[PDB]
Amino acid sequence: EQKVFFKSLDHLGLTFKQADKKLLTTKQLISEISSIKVDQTNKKIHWLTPKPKSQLDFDFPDKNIFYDILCLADTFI
DNA sequence: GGCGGCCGCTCTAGAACAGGATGTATATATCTGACACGTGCCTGGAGACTAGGGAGTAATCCCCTTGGCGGTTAAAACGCGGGGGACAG
Helix, strand or coil, X not given: CCCCXXXXXXXXXXXXXXXHHHHCCHHHHHHHHHHXXXXXXXXXXXXXXXXXXXXXXXXXXCCHHHHHHHHHHHHHC
C-alpha cells in the first residue's frame, strides 16, 4: 500500500503522461487560441464594436524561472 | 317424391405379442501346460574410497518485451438480397 495508495490518489497525474503528449501540440494550441479569438469577437459583436487586443495573458513575477528552464535546456543538450 | 347428412357395418392394415431357431452363456469332467515356488548359483549393484568438474549461486549488463499511448486506413460486424445446396422424401 506504500506504493499503491499514493498512485491511487493521483487521478490526472496517471493520465498526464499521455495528456501532455496529446494536448501540448500545435493544432491543439491553435484551436485553443482561435476559440478565445472568436469568443472575444462575437462577445463584442453582441456588446460593443471595438475589440480588445489582449487575450491569454501570462504574469512573470519571478526572474529565476527563466534560469531554471535554461538549466533544464542545457542539461538536455 | 328426390337428395344431403348421419351413423352403423364390414374391409384393411399397423402393431403389440407369443412361439420357433440357432449361436452362443454357463455347469460340471477332465486334461494340461505353463505358473510360480524352491534351489542353486553367480554375476551386477552397493558400501567405501579417490578425485574433479560442471552447476548453484552471486554479480553484471544490456536487451527486449510489456505497457501505453494517438492515427489511420484495413477490416470485423450488422444487415439486406438472394441463391444455390443439405437434407427429407
